[PDB]
Amino acid sequence: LAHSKMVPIPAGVFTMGTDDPQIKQDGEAPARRVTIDAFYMDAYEVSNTEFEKFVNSTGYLTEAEKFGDSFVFEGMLAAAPWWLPVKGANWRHPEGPDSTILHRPDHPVLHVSWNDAVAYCTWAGKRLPTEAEWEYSCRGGLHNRLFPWGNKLQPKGQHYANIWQGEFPVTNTGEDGFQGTAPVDAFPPNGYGLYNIVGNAWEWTSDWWTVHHSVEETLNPKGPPSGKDRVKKGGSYMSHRSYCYRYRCAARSQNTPDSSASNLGFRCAADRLP
Ligand SMILES: *[C@@H]1O[C@H](CO)[C@@H](O[C@@H]2O[C@H](CO)[C@@H](O)[C@H](O)[C@H]2NC(C)=O)[C@H](O)[C@H]1NC(C)=O
Ligand SMILES: [Ca+2]
Numbered sequence: 372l373a374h375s376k377m378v379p380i381p382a383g384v385f386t387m388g389t390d391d392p393q394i395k396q397d398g399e400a401p402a403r404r405v406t407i408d409a410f411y412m413d414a415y416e417v418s419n420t421e422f423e424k425f426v427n428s429t430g431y432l433t434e435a436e437k438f439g440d441s442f443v444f445e446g447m448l449a450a451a452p453w454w455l456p457v458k459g460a461n462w463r464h465p466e467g468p469d470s471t472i473l474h475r476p477d478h479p480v481l482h483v484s485w486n487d488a489v490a491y492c493t494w495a496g497k498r499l500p501t502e503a504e505w506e507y508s509c510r511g512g513l514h515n516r517l518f519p520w521g522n523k524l525q526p527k528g529q530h531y532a533n534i535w536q537g538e539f540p541v542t543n544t545g546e547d548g549f550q551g552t553a554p555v556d557a558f559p560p561n562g563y564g565l566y567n568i569v570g571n572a573w574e575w576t577s578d579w580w581t582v583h584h585s586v587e588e589t590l591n592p593k594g595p596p597s598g599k600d601r602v603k604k605g606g607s608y609m610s611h612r613s614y615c616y617r618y619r620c621a622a623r624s625q626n627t628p629d630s631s632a633s634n635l636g637f638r639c640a641a642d643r644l645p
């Protein structure tokens with residue numbers, strides 16, 4: 372395993388967002404040309420094992436642990452009836468106190484807040500990516516496509532990401548091989564060498580959330596200077612076309628930075644190799 376490895380994301384110009392928004396309320400539009408300097412991105416979502424190294428080193432207590440609860444999806448025992456605040460749910464106990472990570476060390480760490488993620492990434496000599504860096508990387512060198520790999524959900528009849536199959540939220544068939552999370556190195560890489568950039572765990576980025584974007588060309592944009600929620604990207608193992616069509620690189624959602632949940636993790640980035 373080399374689950375803290377990073378890949379070089381090349382310098383480039385890309386179209387962020389889309390002029391054919393699928394969830395207009397989320398400010399997927401307008402499409403805008405963005406220039407990104409070369410940098411490095413974690414190939415993998417941060418895993419339980421990698422987060423455990425951080426905690427062993429620092430003694431860090433996550434915000435869910437301090438608050439004493441976190442959000443868990445009902446189907447695996449609030450924003451929706453299927454999100455329950457579970458006492459004792461946290462990164463080590465993803466469905467509550469009588470769950471464990473012992474059998475899933477290589478799955479993405481969950482129940483980590485924005486602050487938790489920033490602490491980890493900085494400890495590791497890295498940082499969170501910006502939304503623009505994250506989306507550019509997600510797109511994997513392709514222009515104006517829905518997914519990191521193209522426009523077809525199952526190219527060549529193959530599953531390319533861990534999302535939901537079946538009727539959400541009642542029945543997840545596990546057709547793609549995983550009902551909950553998958554190992555961080557599951558599924559094919561995109562064109563830049565990134566795994567699970569759509570699906571599996573949602574991913575925090577550094578930006579404050581807004582839905583108001585200019586079409587002006589920008590360079591290494593950081594998002595708005597203020598806000599109340601931070602941007603998350605990429606969808607999760609819960610995502611489905613029928614209700615949360617957000618396993619697209621252009622998609623986006625938000626949460627307050629102290630929020631945590633059983634489908635939300637992160638990966639780091641860095642200007643240079645640490
Ligand atoms: C985090 O630290 C724990 C506690 O030290 C590690 O688990 C121990 O590791 C030692 C050293 O190899 C083993 O001999 C013990 O059997 C382990 N003890 C227990 C109670 O599990 C753990 O491996 C560390 N985690 C990571 C990811 O580095
Ligand atoms: Ca799945």
Ligand SMILES: [Ca+2]
Binds near residue numbers: 570
């Ligand atoms: Ca992901």
